[PDB]
Motif scaffolding. Structure first.
Motif, PDB file in Angstrom:
ATOM      1  N   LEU A 174      43.370  25.358  33.869  1.00 11.15           N
ATOM      2  CA  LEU A 174      44.026  25.720  32.848  1.00 11.15           C
ATOM      3  C   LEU A 174      45.009  24.796  32.507  1.00 11.15           C
ATOM      4  CD1 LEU A 174      43.663  27.436  30.056  1.00 11.15           C
ATOM      5  CD2 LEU A 174      45.007  29.252  31.284  1.00 11.15           C
ATOM      6  N   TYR A 175      45.921  24.610  33.416  1.00 11.28           N
ATOM      7  CA  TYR A 175      46.870  23.775  33.447  1.00 11.28           C
ATOM      8  C   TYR A 175      46.597  22.329  32.817  1.00 11.28           C
ATOM      9  CZ  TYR A 175      51.524  21.737  33.791  1.00 11.28           C
ATOM     10  OH  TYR A 175      52.687  20.706  33.780  1.00 11.28           O
ATOM     11  N   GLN A 176      45.596  21.874  33.671  1.00 11.01           N
ATOM     12  CA  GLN A 176      45.015  20.598  33.300  1.00 11.01           C
ATOM     13  C   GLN A 176      44.601  20.477  31.706  1.00 11.01           C
ATOM     14  OE1 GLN A 176      42.612  20.612  36.740  1.00 11.01           O
ATOM     15  NE2 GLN A 176      43.967  19.338  37.886  1.00 11.01           N
ATOM     16  N   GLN A 177      43.902  21.607  31.469  1.00 10.04           N
ATOM     17  CA  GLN A 177      43.145  21.602  30.344  1.00 10.04           C
ATOM     18  C   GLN A 177      44.371  21.441  29.141  1.00 10.04           C
ATOM     19  OE1 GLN A 177      40.819  24.939  29.667  1.00 10.04           O
ATOM     20  NE2 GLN A 177      38.966  24.166  30.993  1.00 10.04           N
ATOM     21  N   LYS A 178      45.689  22.407  29.348  1.00 12.13           N
ATOM     22  CA  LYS A 178      46.492  22.615  28.438  1.00 12.13           C
ATOM     23  C   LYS A 178      47.496  21.194  28.608  1.00 12.13           C
ATOM     24  CE  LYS A 178      48.643  25.993  30.185  1.00 12.13           C
ATOM     25  NZ  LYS A 178      49.377  27.125  30.692  1.00 12.13           N
ATOM     26  N   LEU A 238      44.571  33.537  23.401  1.00  8.07           N
ATOM     27  CA  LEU A 238      44.137  34.195  24.590  1.00  8.07           C
ATOM     28  C   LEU A 238      45.287  34.120  25.411  1.00  8.07           C
ATOM     29  CD1 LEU A 238      40.452  32.932  24.798  1.00  8.07           C
ATOM     30  CD2 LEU A 238      41.140  35.261  25.122  1.00  8.07           C
ATOM     31  N   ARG A 239      45.999  35.021  25.581  1.00  3.28           N
ATOM     32  CA  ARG A 239      47.380  35.118  26.288  1.00  3.28           C
ATOM     33  C   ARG A 239      47.208  35.995  27.489  1.00  3.28           C
ATOM     34  NH1 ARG A 239      51.925  35.401  21.293  1.00  3.28           N
ATOM     35  NH2 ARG A 239      50.797  33.909  19.844  1.00  3.28           N
ATOM     36  N   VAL A 240      46.425  35.738  28.396  1.00  9.05           N
ATOM     37  CA  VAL A 240      45.653  36.349  29.453  1.00  9.05           C
ATOM     38  C   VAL A 240      45.860  35.761  30.767  1.00  9.05           C
ATOM     39  CG1 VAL A 240      44.379  37.709  28.012  1.00  9.05           C
ATOM     40  CG2 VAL A 240      43.433  35.754  28.880  1.00  9.05           C
ATOM     41  N   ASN A 241      45.332  36.114  32.034  1.00  8.34           N
ATOM     42  CA  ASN A 241      45.357  35.457  32.983  1.00  8.34           C
ATOM     43  C   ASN A 241      44.115  34.370  32.883  1.00  8.34           C
ATOM     44  OD1 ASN A 241      45.166  34.553  35.788  1.00  8.34           O
ATOM     45  ND2 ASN A 241      44.707  36.584  36.677  1.00  8.34           N
ATOM     46  N   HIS A 242      44.259  33.317  33.799  1.00  8.52           N
ATOM     47  CA  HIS A 242      43.317  32.086  33.449  1.00  8.52           C
ATOM     48  C   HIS A 242      41.902  32.604  33.620  1.00  8.52           C
ATOM     49  CE1 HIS A 242      42.937  31.770  37.847  1.00  8.52           C
ATOM     50  NE2 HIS A 242      44.105  31.978  38.018  1.00  8.52           N
ATOM     51  N   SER A 267      46.275  44.150  42.938  1.00  5.10           N
ATOM     52  CA  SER A 267      45.912  42.858  43.323  1.00  5.10           C
ATOM     53  C   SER A 267      45.311  41.635  42.307  1.00  5.10           C
ATOM     54  CB  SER A 267      44.730  42.925  44.448  1.00  5.10           C
ATOM     55  OG  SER A 267      43.441  43.074  43.483  1.00  5.10           O
ATOM     56  N   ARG A 268      45.747  40.295  42.516  1.00  5.18           N
ATOM     57  CA  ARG A 268      45.055  39.465  41.450  1.00  5.18           C
ATOM     58  C   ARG A 268      43.948  38.458  41.945  1.00  5.18           C
ATOM     59  NH1 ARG A 268      51.569  38.383  39.328  1.00  5.18           N
ATOM     60  NH2 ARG A 268      51.399  40.099  37.852  1.00  5.18           N
ATOM     61  N   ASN A 269      43.184  39.086  42.820  1.00  3.90           N
ATOM     62  CA  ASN A 269      42.053  38.064  43.211  1.00  3.90           C
ATOM     63  C   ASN A 269      41.148  37.734  42.052  1.00  3.90           C
ATOM     64  OD1 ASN A 269      39.825  37.013  44.429  1.00  3.90           O
ATOM     65  ND2 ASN A 269      39.299  38.861  45.864  1.00  3.90           N
ATOM     66  N   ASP A 270      40.651  36.490  42.076  1.00  2.08           N
ATOM     67  CA  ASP A 270      39.919  35.933  40.972  1.00  2.08           C
ATOM     68  C   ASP A 270      38.614  36.571  40.728  1.00  2.08           C
ATOM     69  OD1 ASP A 270      42.021  34.210  39.866  1.00  2.08           O
ATOM     70  OD2 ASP A 270      41.157  32.700  41.194  1.00  2.08           O
ATOM     71  N   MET A 271      37.970  36.751  42.094  1.00  2.00           N
ATOM     72  CA  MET A 271      36.806  37.385  42.112  1.00  2.00           C
ATOM     73  C   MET A 271      36.750  38.845  41.551  1.00  2.00           C
ATOM     74  SD  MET A 271      34.899  38.197  45.699  1.00  2.00           S
ATOM     75  CE  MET A 271      34.671  36.395  46.104  1.00  2.00           C
ATOM     76  N   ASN A 272      37.637  39.739  42.145  1.00  2.00           N
ATOM     77  CA  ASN A 272      37.775  41.063  41.508  1.00  2.00           C
ATOM     78  C   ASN A 272      38.235  41.088  40.032  1.00  2.00           C
ATOM     79  OD1 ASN A 272      37.092  42.086  44.190  1.00  2.00           O
ATOM     80  ND2 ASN A 272      39.001  42.585  44.679  1.00  2.00           N
ATOM     81  N   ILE A 273      39.160  40.121  39.656  1.00  2.00           N
ATOM     82  CA  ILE A 273      39.532  39.982  38.372  1.00  2.00           C
ATOM     83  C   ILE A 273      38.317  39.721  37.329  1.00  2.00           C
ATOM     84  CG2 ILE A 273      40.668  38.377  36.606  1.00  2.00           C
ATOM     85  CD1 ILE A 273      42.932  38.479  38.760  1.00  2.00           C
ATOM     86  N   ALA A 274      37.452  38.767  37.741  1.00  2.00           N
ATOM     87  CA  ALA A 274      36.255  38.387  36.946  1.00  2.00           C
ATOM     88  C   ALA A 274      35.471  39.915  36.875  1.00  2.00           C
ATOM     89  CB  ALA A 274      35.579  37.413  37.374  1.00  2.00           C
TER      90      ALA A 274
END
Ligand SMILES: [Mg+2]
Ligand SMILES: [Mg+2]
Lengths: 250, 308, 168, 245
Positions: B40-44, C102-106, C127-134
């Motif tokens: 996302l940073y690289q896209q921005k 889209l002012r959210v987590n990546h 927790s902020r795991n990308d797997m679980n987040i998705a």
RNA sequence: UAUAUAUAUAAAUUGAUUAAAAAUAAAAUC
């Protein structure tokens, strides 16, 4: 994964081969030359489709995707021309059907990547004169004329002002032949649109260079407030322009 | 402001608000912005690079951040809301000149403003940052507009050599016509799709000498009698005007000839009216940009957080 | 339809080891999202020993299989706030005004971009795991969201009544 | 026609000049006799009302002939977009109240103390007609909107203004009268919007702002069509009228 | 009132032998 990517053309182009060590050339310059074509003794690039402006009220915008990167054309016949292994520009192997298959709006789209961008239509001079006569002389309000001609009110008012300036210039003949030629050229490059408070002025005796004017105001609303925020040394420093056009700190 | 440097480099391939040939090629070859296989940073960052190369190259980054308006305005197709990221710049005077086709670049419009060639409602404005209110009328001196939209005036030497070559080729044409006149006329008609006096009417011209014609332009003016340019050196009909005087549109003008919606233009007088601030509408945006909505939204997300 | 319209974006790409007696065996996990940007999205996962390309391959097929319709409000945002707990991730997501980014987590950003969610503002707690987040993002998008039409019909009310009143 | 004739049992709708003349003679005798007998003009009106009402029921079935079926019948051409059929039906199957009252006043002065034959034929042909209520007037206004006839619109808002005076309108309750007048004002606003005369529409809205509650649902068409031309002044004044609340 | 002008020779800084570039950057001209 981001990489510093040298902006090579997306389309295919004839790249460099074995080079004389003193050539000192780059692929990008070759792409430039192939995009343009041969350079005339006058300095022109006649072979290109974009060197010359259009003249039939149909804007000619870049279509690299619909052209597959081939941007050379015969200046007279206007038939496509493409590079050849011989090294001389010649007719294409096959017809590019996508240059024939252009959408109606895409003709009016300046930039390939942005579909929402489009070029506004130029009003015909007769229509401008008609609007000027209807408003100034007949008295039809800008609302009525806007409804009549499918235009916006601010555009109508701008048309009236510009036709007023045009009338003055024509009265003094301030327009020159170069200006007329540029006007006629630009007109043909775009599609043509189809239809209270108390005030006291103080006494001015002789020799006074200016006149005081007093406007009524109410305490608690008139004055410069004490302890106001000083923004001069800040990024939100307020700046304005005096009516003379001089920049002042407001 | 920013000192212009490597604005038109082909390796970088950043499109600029200019009518230049190199800018034309950079726009041509780019295709589309590549936001794929990127964090996302690289896209921005890529969106910033691409959009900020076009919209306000001269503006300083810390100045653009202050100018940037986090709140935008919008008045079945989809409204492109985030193309209005740079609509705030469209009210600046120099941008208005460039969009009105009164200059070939935003920097050229800036120099026009700073050199006193621009008026807004009849008062000479010498500050490029002056912001236009709706309904304002601004005008540019017609000579500078003609220079902006016209070819470069050749030097005396360059046009003299060009005339040398034109005499050479005209003599060649008349020679070949005299040798083989009938089929010359027929084959000229072949492109256009017998009178032997046709070749007789055509008359030779004398080759000029650069050494003898140098430094004497009034003499060179009389010495040329080509059928198309009678008695003037090429491109210098009146040598005291800032442009190619037999007024000719500048090369590579069709690609960049966009008629803006928010301005109403009068080319005959070199005047314009600022109708409104650009506003996005369903399926159309009045902010003339070469980038798609994804690039603009990535730039908008960048500038909302200031790169965080 | 599938190739031209659906867009694939890798969300997770990683090496996971299963140390066997002889040595460390390393395989490649890939998690991807496929969405047409027009109200249909799905997630896919792939595991391949020899090269990540096969992992992403099977992940793409799996995402295509689980492609599901997603409720959307005005085709730009979620119908209302979604507060969702998934295996240790707490997603608080809020609908937003038109033009809002889209002012959210990546990870949520790519999911929304694929699924056509234009407008959203959210925070990820615990927790902020990308797997679980998705995974939790898609689950909260489809389970935890109810359409105004469906709510009104379940309540036996007309949309004019259920719609909120304007106050200022 | 079949329903109006009771399936053909009643031969009312079919006509002849013989029947016209004889019925004119009969109603001449009847009405000029009844004129003197009544004590006051009000009682003579009451007798004429009773006669015409009973005459309508004996003439044709009451049930199939009413406001509702007539509304649907006249609505057919409007949806189908034929003006001539609609106006023919409206003239043949409708009468305006104020015109009837004027005719009866004329015949009152005529008997107590071709136009007279015309009035007798009018009171005779009332068997074919129903009074123009507010709803029928609004339907004809819708017809004007659909067909973009300025003359029809002018005729109908003249006739509605006259009908306000006649006693059937004043019999209704004040809130119903104001609601129907608000409906007619909204219809006029729609007509002037579609015709493109925005200033007159804004004038109608502004003049009656206090008497009528104007909602955005009514002025959505006007607001859209103003925003198309970007009349920020007119948009602002209209929106302030609507949303002052 | 023609106009895709063509031929030769000579040179051609740094890196490199082509998607390896520096670089339209210099100079020059308006
Ligand atoms: Mg990096
Ligand atoms: Mg070397």
């Amino acid at each position: 994964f981001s990489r510093r990517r040298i902006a090579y053309p997306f389309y295919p182009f004839k790249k460099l081969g074995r080079q004389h060590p003193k050539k000192h050339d780059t692929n990008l310059k070759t792409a430039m030359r192939q995009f343009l074509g041969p350079k005339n003794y006058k300095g022109e690039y006649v072979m290109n489709k974009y060197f010359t402006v259009p003249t039939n009220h149909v804007p000619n915008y870049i279509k690299p995707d619909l052209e597959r990167g081939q941007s050379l054309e015969h200046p007279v016949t206007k038939k496509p021309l493409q590079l050849r292994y011989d090294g001389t520009l010649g007719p294409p192997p096959v017809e590019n059907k996508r240059l024939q298959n252009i959408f109606k709006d895409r003709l009016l789209q300046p930039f390939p990547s942005n579909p929402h961008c489009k070029t506004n239509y130029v009003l015909s001079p007769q229509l401008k004169q008609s609007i000027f006569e209807e408003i100034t002389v007949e008295g039809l309000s800008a609302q009525q004329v806007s409804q009549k001609y499918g235009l916006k009110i601010p555009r109508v008012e701008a048309i009236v002002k510009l036709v007023s300036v045009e009338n003055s210039w024509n009265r003094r003949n301030r327009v020159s032949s170069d200006l007329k030629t540029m006007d006629e050229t630009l007109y043909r490059m775009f599609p043509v649109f189809d239809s209270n408070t108390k005030v006291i002025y103080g006494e001015l005796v002789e020799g006074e260079r200016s006149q005081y004017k007093f406007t009524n105001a109410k305490v608690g609303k008139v004055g410069y407030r004490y302890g106001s925020g000083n923004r001069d040394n800040k990024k939100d420093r307020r700046i304005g322009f005096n009516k003379l056009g001089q920049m002042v700190y407001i | 402001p920013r000192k212009a440097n490597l604005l038109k480099s082909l390796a970088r391939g950043r499109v600029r608000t200019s009518f230049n040939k190199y800018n034309l090629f950079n726009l041509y070859k780019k295709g589309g912005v590549d936001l794929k296989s990127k964090s996302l940073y690289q896209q921005k960052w890529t969106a910033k690079q691409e959009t900020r190369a076009y919209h306000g190259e001269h503006l300083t980054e810390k100045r653009w951040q202050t100018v940037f308006k986090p709140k935008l305005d919008s008045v079945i197709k989809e409204t492109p809301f985030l193309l209005q990221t740079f609509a705030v710049l469209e009210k600046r005077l120099d941008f208005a000149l460039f969009r009105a086709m009164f200059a070939s670049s935003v920097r050229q419009a800036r120099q026009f403003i700073l050199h006193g060639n621009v008026r807004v409602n009849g008062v000479k404005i010498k500050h490029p940052s002056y912001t236009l209110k709706p309904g304002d009328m601004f005008s540019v001196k017609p000579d500078k507009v003609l220079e902006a939209l016209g070819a470069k005036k050749p030097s005396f030497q360059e046009a003299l050599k060009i005339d040398k070559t034109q005499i050479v080729l005209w003599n060649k044409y008349v020679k070949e016509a005299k040798t083989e006149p009938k089929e010359v006329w027929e084959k000229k008609l072949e492109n256009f799709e017998f009178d032997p006096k046709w070749a007789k009417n055509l008359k030779y011209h004398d080759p000029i000498k650069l050494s003898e014609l140098e430094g004497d332009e009034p003499k060179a003016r009389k010495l040329i009698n080509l059928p198309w340019q009678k008695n003037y050196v090429y491109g210098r009909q009146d040598p005291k005007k800032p442009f190619f005087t037999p007024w000719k549109p500048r090369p590579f003008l069709s690609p960049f000839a966009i008629l803006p919606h928010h301005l109403e233009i009068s080319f005959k007088t070199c005047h314009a009216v600022y109708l409104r601030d650009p506003v996005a509408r369903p399926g159309q945006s009045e902010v003339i940009s070469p980038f798609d909505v994804p690039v603009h939204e990535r730039a908008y997300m960048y500038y909302l957080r200031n790169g965080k | 339809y599938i190739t031209r319209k659906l867009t694939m974006k890798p969300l997770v790409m990683k090496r996971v080891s299963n140390q066997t007696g002889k040595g460390k065996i390393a395989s490649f996990y890939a998690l991807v999202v496929v969405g047409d940007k027009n109200g249909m999205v799905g997630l896919g996962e792939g595991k391949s020993r020899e090269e990540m390309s096969k992992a992403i391959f099977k992940a793409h097929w799996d995402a295509v299989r689980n492609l599901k319709e997603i409720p959307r409000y005005e085709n730009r945002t979620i119908y209302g706030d979604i507060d969702f707990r998934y295996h240790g991730v707490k997603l608080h997501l809020r609908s937003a005004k038109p033009g809002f980014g889209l002012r959210v987590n990546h990870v949520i950003f790519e999911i929304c971009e694929c699924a056509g969610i234009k407008d959203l503002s959210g925070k990820v707690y615990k927790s902020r795991n990308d797997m679980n987040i998705a995974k939790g993002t898609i689950e909260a998008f489809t389970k935890a969201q109810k359409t105004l039409d469906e709510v009104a019909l379940g309540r036996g009310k007309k949309l004019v009544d259920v719609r909120k009143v304007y106050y200022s | 026609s079949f329903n109006m004739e009771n399936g053909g049992t009643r031969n009312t709708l079919t006509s002849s000049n013989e029947a016209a003349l004889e019925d004119i003679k009969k109603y001449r005798q009847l009405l000029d006799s009844f004129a003197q007998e009544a004590e006051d003009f009000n009682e003579f009106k009451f007798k004429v009302m009773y006669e015409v009402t009973k005459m309508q029921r004996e003439s044709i079935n009451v049930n199939v002939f009413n406001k509702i079926s007539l509304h649907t019948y006249l609505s057919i051409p409007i949806n189908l977009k034929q003006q001539k059929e609609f106006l023919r039906r409206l003239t043949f199957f409708t009468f305006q109240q104020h015109e009837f009252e004027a005719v009866i006043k004329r015949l009152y002065e005529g008997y107590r103390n071709n136009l007279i034959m015309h009035d007798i034929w009018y009171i005779t042909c009332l068997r074919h007609k129903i009074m123009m209520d507010t709803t029928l007037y609004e339907l004809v206004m819708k017809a004007a909107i659909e067909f973009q006839n300025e003359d029809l619109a002018k005729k109908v808002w003249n006739d509605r203004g006259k009908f306000r005076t006649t006693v059937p309108f004043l019999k209704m309750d004040q809130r119903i009268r104001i609601a129907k007048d608000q409906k007619f004002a909204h219809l006029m606003v729609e007509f002037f919007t579609k015709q493109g005369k925005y200033s007159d529409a804004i004038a109608i809205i502004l003049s009656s702002k206090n008497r009528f509650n104007w909602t955005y649902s009514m002025v959505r068409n006007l607001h859209k069509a103003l925003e198309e031309i970007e009349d920020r002044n007119s948009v602002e004044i209209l929106l302030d009228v609507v949303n002052k609340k």
